[PDB]
Amino acid sequence: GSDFDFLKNLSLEELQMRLKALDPMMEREIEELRQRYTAKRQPILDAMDAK
Amino acid sequence: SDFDFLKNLSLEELQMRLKALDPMMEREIEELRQRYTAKRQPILDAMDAK
């Protein structure tokens, strides 16, 4: 990403492209985070069921 | 840690370990969302300045 000072000099169509790209990037990041925690929970969950 | 360690702990200890992950996850998700909202603003402002 860039700062406002650089962004303001981009075309409106380039800006809309940049704005739109944030959404799947964000969705990818949160998905990875959720999977990261699922993976953390799994061995604890199994350990509880193994008793 | 690994299942081979966790399997030897009490049910109460394991439940505590599960519950401990919750606010950590909550925090990191909120940080992720704030970072997205942040990234949007200078682009939105750049659009409105033109």
Numbering used by the authors:
A (entry chain A): 1 to 51
B (entry chain B): 2 to 51
Q: What does the article say, verbatim?
A:
The main dimeric interactions consist of hydrophobic interactions of the nonpolar side chains and several inter-protomer hydrogen bonds. Firstly, the structures of the two protomers were found to be slightly different from each other in the MST2 SARAH homodimer, while those in the MST1 SARAH homodimer were identical. Thus, h2 of one protomer had a more linear structure than that of the other protomer. In addition to this difference, the hydrogen bonds between the h2 helices of the two protomers were not symmetric. The structural differences between the two protomers in the MST2 homodimer seem to arise from crystal-packing forces. In addition, the short N-terminal helices h1 and h1′ in the MST2 homodimer have been identified as typical α-helices, while those in the MST1 homodimer are 310-helices. Among the water molecules in the MST2 SARAH structure with B factor values below 25 Å2, only one water molecule mediates an inter-protomer interaction, while six water molecules in the MST1–RASSF5 SARAH structure were identified as mediators of inter-protomer hydrogen bonds.
The MST-mediated apoptosis pathway is controlled by its interaction with RASSF family proteins and the WW45 protein. Interestingly, all three classes of tumour suppressors, MST, RASSF and WW45, interact through their SARAH (SAV/RASSF/HPO) domains.
